[PDB]
Every structure is written in structure tokens, then in C-alpha cells.
Design a protein around this ligand. Sequence first.
Ligand code: HEM
Ligand code: HEM
Ligand SMILES: Cc1cc(N)nc(CCc2cncc(CCc3cc(C)cc(N)n3)c2)c1
Ligand SMILES: Cc1cc(N)nc(CCc2cncc(CCc3cc(C)cc(N)n3)c2)c1
Ligand SMILES: C[C@H](O)[C@H](O)[C@H]1CNc2nc(N)[nH]c(=O)c2N1
Ligand SMILES: C[C@H](O)[C@H](O)[C@H]1CNc2nc(N)[nH]c(=O)c2N1
Ligand SMILES: [Zn+2]
Lengths: 403, 405
Amino acid sequence: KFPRVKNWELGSITYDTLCAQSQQDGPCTPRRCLGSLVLPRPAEQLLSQARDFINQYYSSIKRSGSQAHEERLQEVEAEVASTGTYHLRESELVFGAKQAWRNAPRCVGRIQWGKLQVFDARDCSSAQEMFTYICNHIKYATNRGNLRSAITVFPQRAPGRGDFRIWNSQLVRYAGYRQQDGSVRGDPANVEITELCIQHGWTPGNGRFDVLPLLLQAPDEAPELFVLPPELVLEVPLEHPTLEWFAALGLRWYALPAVSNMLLEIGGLEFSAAPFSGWYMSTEIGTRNLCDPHRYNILEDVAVCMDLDTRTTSSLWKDKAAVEINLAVLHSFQLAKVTIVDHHAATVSFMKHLDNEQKARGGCPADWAWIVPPISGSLTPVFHQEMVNYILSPAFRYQPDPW
Amino acid sequence: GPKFPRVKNWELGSITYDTLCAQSQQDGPCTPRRCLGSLVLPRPAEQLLSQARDFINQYYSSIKRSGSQAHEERLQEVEAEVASTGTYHLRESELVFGAKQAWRNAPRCVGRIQWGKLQVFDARDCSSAQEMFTYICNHIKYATNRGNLRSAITVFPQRAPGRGDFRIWNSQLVRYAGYRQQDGSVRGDPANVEITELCIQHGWTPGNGRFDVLPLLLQAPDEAPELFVLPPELVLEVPLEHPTLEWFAALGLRWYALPAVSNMLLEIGGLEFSAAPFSGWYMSTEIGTRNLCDPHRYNILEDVAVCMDLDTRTTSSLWKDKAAVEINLAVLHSFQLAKVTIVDHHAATVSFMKHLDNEQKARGGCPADWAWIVPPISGSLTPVFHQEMVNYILSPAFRYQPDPW
Ligand code: HEM
Ligand code: HEM
Ligand SMILES: Cc1cc(N)nc(CCc2cncc(CCc3cc(C)cc(N)n3)c2)c1
Ligand SMILES: Cc1cc(N)nc(CCc2cncc(CCc3cc(C)cc(N)n3)c2)c1
Ligand SMILES: C[C@H](O)[C@H](O)[C@H]1CNc2nc(N)[nH]c(=O)c2N1
Ligand SMILES: C[C@H](O)[C@H](O)[C@H]1CNc2nc(N)[nH]c(=O)c2N1
Ligand SMILES: [Zn+2]
């Protein structure tokens, strides 16, 4: 019934009762845990989700069971009964979006969940307009390096008509150019989106860090290409506090992590284009982006620069280099005055978040494999913390590529 | 298409489906409503017969004699015995098979590529705590093999109806004392404060150091536990030093060569072996990262970073990470110098990938606990990090069992 959750470093125990609020099943069954998989494969439905969400709204403002609450419940009844769907009021949308971040079990930054700038772009009718809204988002969220978390919510989905979509997986992304030699110049994760941009008429560059254009799609239309004005995209040259040669590698990364391919579900309405951004955790760039073998794969290069025995796993040249790379990322960002959090600082804040949520809701959904950083896992206190995973709504969902 | 979990490796983009999980005859802690996959501890008439029937079938399959006369006769024999004594007994080769099979089946063990190479010492004749001591000494001798470590297990007599258990009170055959201090701190290993205290209560004269080898608390059926001291020539230890940081040897850190779990239950065809200590060789992260750096263990991260002249005042100097790497490097280096088997987390994980491929061929899946397979340092630097894994309970199995006190 109520799962007991232990911290093995401190011996402290809690119980999770938040999890009974889960209405949507996950991948696990008593027979097998699929906790580690990245993704598994009427108008009563929508009405109860809407009721439930409205309740969570009026409760959150301590106006639960009062008049405005009843008359807004009726408003929805009346809208679905007539049109099979309904619309949200701006502040309710502001509630959902925040709450969808709060509920994101794979997110280590949720201490921040309350601080979210929310742009209503539901009055969008063209890719043209989408681009404008996307551009104000980037400008707002960047703030010359003092990054501020934002979301922009484009118009909701609708029965028998195409979705508004952002084809790009993030708003700022580096091209992947499939070379003759079968190698990849640029970022390998983006080979395919790079190819679509080119198919839709973009003139490519030939560098390792070419900011990709956006492919924006308004309902039932071919997507349209838009180039991000290069002065909007803040970038950070990478260099190392003590290693003088690192900078020559000409390595760099963009300041703004902004997801743009995820669906936002609130009270049963679905928002198919609803990009959000906060700030980077250094390990995302220093460990995964630069060090994954199927990414920029810079480990060996760097270790050879460092002059390490590469001929053997037992010298730990991988672990040594990986650390220098992460350090170079932190230093560089801190030097260019651009918000970044290290994995130690981030997981410390996460632990306090678990605590706040414990008092606030009786738990916190959390995905241990995603919350523990890609290096030095057991050196952070999340490593020792048991965690319960489950789906609460409002939620972000993964959605399949629009092509 | 397939009616089974799909399993993807995100580095190579390769796909497999786990069909072995259909074999699982025991439920874990997850439900469709919520995943409890990271809990360390999750919360007989016909029953025995069917577990027994299943294991026998497993044994006859492994010898490619499924359906044969010896097979149905062994089944008949086992039923005859249960429907008479309420229990039954494994043949020698059945025990060797179930033991290897339990190691094969263990989701949390990264070292399973070695599963087929296990020395199984039978000790189901053992009848006193003195004799347990003897068996254990023999085991340690054999497994340590002067540094050239060899996987082994020693099986003591099974649970009986109306007879007490064989038990090794110690969680490991070799562990350091943890002495609770005047000032609240712990000298030694804080993991072992209780067992240390229990040893002194049962008569041990304690030492006063950070690395004192504990004595054994051994419990024959229905008796008080008797205390036994391992002769020091039997416990191989490695003094720790760094390849280049010269001051590291001056810390007087050290570890023992033989990781030997001693408190686990070994379940085979429903029979329960409450005392069946098993050992292999260390992966270097266990010593260098968990034992030496956990805040609730030796906790040497700060001492070392100070020596390294790092900025411990701020997180973003990655002082924790830099020191942790050296400590790990010193573990590897010192074991390698002293000629004691060890495997670094890179090589260990590569070979587990290879173990996954083999098992995919042989059984159609491999139960594995992601959070336990991925090493505590440099996680995504290892191929296991990008491998999805299905976790489920197969039997034969090893289970955690509560302390006997
Ligand atoms: C404010 C600073 C933030 C930090 C430091 C942070 C950190 C992270 C990290 C490290 C991940 C794992 C990323 C990976 O390995 O791919 C993640 C995932 C996630 N974050 Fe946060 N995040 C932040 C803000 C936000 C914001 C503003 C939102 C939404 C408004 C958000 C929603 C999510 C979601 C939905 C995921 C799941 C990723 C997926 O399934 O693709 N995060 N976050
Ligand atoms: C031969 C080299 C071996 C290596 C490198 C190895 C490695 C490991 C590691 C790193 C762990 C995680 C332990 C922890 O984090 O505390 C583990 C757990 C485990 N190992 Fe292995 N192991 C080896 C041999 C064996 C053998 C011979 C057996 C049994 C016959 C075994 C059975 C297990 C079991 C049952 C666990 C789970 C323990 C628990 O849940 O407490 N391993 N192993
Ligand atoms: C196949 C697949 C499934 C899935 N659920 N997510 C993804 C994308 C995962 C992913 C990859 N790179 C980047 C991110 C964004 C990470 C991110 C997001 C935010 C908002 C802040 C921050 N510091 N970091 C997410 C892929
Ligand atoms: C509460 C709890 C539950 C559980 N299942 N295990 C434990 C103890 C886990 C544990 C701690 N230190 C050490 C080990 C064994 C490590 C080990 C064992 C073997 C045989 C080889 C090898 N390389 N390493 C296991 C505690
Ligand atoms: C297969 C495995 O679940 C997958 O590689 C996960 C592991 N943990 C992760 N954790 C984070 N934060 N981000 C990731 O992309 C992943 N990848
Ligand atoms: C909370 C978490 O499940 C727990 O701390 C686990 C994580 N992974 C681990 N993995 C191994 N190999 N050993 C451990 O003790 C742990 N601890
Ligand atoms: Zn699970």
C-alpha cells in the first residue's frame, strides 16, 4: 500500500502517499521491473481529468469548494458537453505548467519548480508567429547570462486537425553532417534533423558547432524553416583553469537548454508545442554531450593531450579526462557569467526538494537512474536515497517525431 | 511485435526482447502504479513440491536429458522423499548446478561472465561450529590462492523442520572492526559497529586500529554462536599506495583481498541453505569508491583532497571527483603491484556486456539491476550505462536474510 523509502547514508525513513494520486500506469509489473527503459510503447475520460485538474487548481489557491470553484466547474461541464473539449484560463495554465515540472520524475532541478516564467502563445495561428514567440522566449530566458526558467505554450491539440509542432528536439542544437568517410562532423545526435533542414532548403555550414535552424509546423502544413538570429543564441567558449592547451580544441557549448519536442498535458488537454528551458547542469555538457561515444566523443583526444596511458583501462585515463572536461565546463561558464550548476550543488538542492515535497504532498515521484549524475554517482547524496517513481498529472510526455 | 519486454542499447541502437522473464516464479516490488526498483530491501506441502519439480526439470535440461527415464525417476524419487520426510536432498551434481545457477541468476552482480567457473565445496556433512570454522579456513585458503583469486562457495546443511539453522553471523568472512568512540565518532569501519559490539559481548579482545580483522561468529543448529579468530597468515591484505602521489602510502590505508559474502541464503528447488558463504574478487570501485569514500564508511575524501591541495571550500572545484579518481587509481595500482586479482570498472562492465550477449543466445534475456550494475564512479563512461535492463527474480537464487540476533 504505502512504500517505505530509506536513505542509506543517514538511516532516515519516509513513506510515500503521494503515489496513490497516480491515475496512469507505468511499465513495471510484479513480475519484472522495467524501471530502466527510456520509453515504453470518451468525453468521460476528459471530463474527469478536467474536474480533477480544476480541483487541484482551486485547492492550490485555498479557494476549494467556494463559488468561483463551482462556477468554473460548471463552465467546463458546459464546454465539453457542447464542443467535446474546453479551454483553460491563463492562470490555470500557469498552474499546470509549474505543476508539470514539479511532477517531472526525471528532473533533478525541481527545487526551482515555483519559479517559472510562462508565456501564453495560445493565440498563435502561424509558423511565422511561432518563430516570433520562440524568439522572445530565448531573449527572455537568456537575460545576458542570468538565465531564468521559462515555458511557452502554443495552442492545444484539437480533434481531426494537425498539431502545432516544433520538429527540433531542443531550440538550440548543433548540426550533424554525415561525411563521406561514414564519420560524423558536428553533433551525431542531430544527423537526421540536420538532414531535414537541408531537405527543406537550408544552406548548411561545415563546422562542429553550427546552430541549427528551426522547423516549425502549424496545423496540416508543411513545416517552415527559420534561422535563429545568431546574436540571440548565447554560447560559451570552453577553456580550462590550468591546462593552457584545452582552449585550442575550439570546443564550445550553448547556454540555453530548451526542450521543444515534448507534450504538455494539463487536465486532459494536450499541448503538442510547449517548449521549456531552465539552465544546464555541468554534467549534461561535460559528461554526456562531449563524452558519450555516440556524441562528440572527445575523451580520447583530451586524455592524449593530457598525456595519459591510453593503452589500458586500469590507468583510469577515461575518468581523469572526464573530470578535466567537466571542470573546463564549469570554469568556462562561470567565467562568461552564465548560469550553470555542478552536479554536487544540484543533487544537494534535490535532497532538500524531496524534503519540501515530503511535508507538502507526502512524497515526490523520482527516477533514480536519471536523478543520479553520469559521473561520481555515489559521491552525491541522491545515490544513497531510495526513490519511488510514478506518473502524476499535469505532466510532460514524450511524443513521437512528427515525420 | 513480440509479447515480451523490448530491450534497447542506446549507444549502438541494438534491440533484443527478454523472453527469459516469463520463467520468473516470484514477484518483485513494482506494480503498474509505481516503480520501487531502487529499494535495497524490498518488502510447506504442495509449495515445496512444485519448486522442487521445477529445479529438477532445470537440472535435466542443463544436461540435455529432459523427458528421459532418469529424469522422471528423479522426479518420482523427490516426491517420494517429500511425501515422507517433508523435505528432500540434492545430489552432488544438482548442488553444483544450483549454486552456479544462483550466481547466474543474481541481478545485482556485475561479474557474471565468470558464473560457469565456480568451485563448489560441499559441506552438508558439517556438524559443529568448530567444523564450520575448519571448512571456512579451507575456503579462504583455496580462494585466495596467494593472490591468484578463485571463485568459490561452501554449502552448509540446509534448513530443517524443527532443527535450528546453520548461520554465519558476520555479513562477510573478512571485515574490519568499527569501534564506537567516546566522542561519538567511529574508529574503523562504521558499517560494522554492531557485529563488532556483538563479538566483544561473546568474548573477543578488541584491538584499537582502523583495520582490525574481525573474528567469526558461527552458529551450529540450536546452539549459541561460538567465536573464532582467523589466523593472520590466512587473510591476505594489500597496503595501499598511489603510483605517483608519494604521500598516499603514508595514509596507512589498506584493504583485504577476498570479498566473501557470508550472510546470504541460498535457495535451490525450495531447499534453503542458510549458511553458504561465497567469494570472488573485487571490482576496484567497491574498495576505492564505496568503502573508502562513502560518508557513512571510512569517508577519506576530504583528507585526501587536503593532501592534494584542492579547494574543498566549494563544490565546483570538483575536488570530490578528482580525489575519488586517485583513490580508485591507488586501489588498482596497489592490487596490481601486490599481484592480487582485481578488475577495474571499465573492464568489468565491458565483460558484462559480453555476458549479456551470451545469455541472450543461451536463455533469451538476463535479469539485471541497472542501479547496481552501473559503477558508482564514471557511470556513463561505461557501456552498461546505455544498456536497458530487465530485472526479475529467477531461482536458484541468493536472498538477503535478516540477522540471526
Ligand atoms: C532550472 C534549472 C533546471 C535544471 C538544472 C534541470 C536539470 C535537469 C536534468 C539534468 C535533466 C536530465 C537531462 C538529461 O540527462 O537529458 C532534466 C530533465 C527534465 N527536466 Fe529539468 N532542469 C531544469 C529546469 C527544468 C524546467 C524549467 C523544466 C520545465 C519547465 C524541466 C523539465 C524537465 C523535464 C520534463 C525532464 C525530463 C527529460 C526527458 O524526459 O527528456 N526542467 N532536468
Ligand atoms: C568473480 C568476480 C566477481 C565480481 C567482480 C563481482 C562483482 C560484484 C559487485 C561489484 C557487486 C555489487 C556489490 C556491492 O555493491 O556491494 C556484486 C554483488 C553480488 N554478487 Fe558478485 N562478483 C563476483 C563474483 C561473485 C560470485 C562468485 C558470486 C556468488 C557465487 C557473486 C554473487 C553476487 C551476489 C548474490 C550479489 C548481490 C549481493 C547483494 O545483493 O547483497 N559474485 N558482485
Ligand atoms: C529518446 C528520448 C526519450 C526521452 N524521454 N527524452 C529524450 C531527450 C532527453 C534529453 C536529451 N538531451 C537534452 C535534454 C534536456 C535536458 C535539460 C532540460 C532542461 C529544461 C534543463 C536542463 N538543465 N537539462 C533531454 C530522448
Ligand atoms: C541491506 C542489504 C541488502 C542486500 N541485498 N545486501 C546488503 C549488503 C550488500 C553488500 C555490501 N558489501 C559487500 C557486498 C558483496 C560484494 C562482493 C561479493 C562478491 C562475491 C564479489 C565481489 N566483487 N563483491 C555486498 C545489504
Ligand atoms: C539506459 C539508461 O536508462 C539511459 O542511458 C539513461 C540512464 N540515465 C540517464 N540519466 C539522465 N539524466 N539522462 C539520461 O539520458 C540518462 N540515460
Ligand atoms: C538507493 C540506491 O538503490 C542504493 O543506495 C544502491 C544504489 N546502487 C548500488 N549499487 C551497488 N553496486 N551497491 C550498492 O550498495 C548500491 N546502493
Ligand atoms: Zn520497477
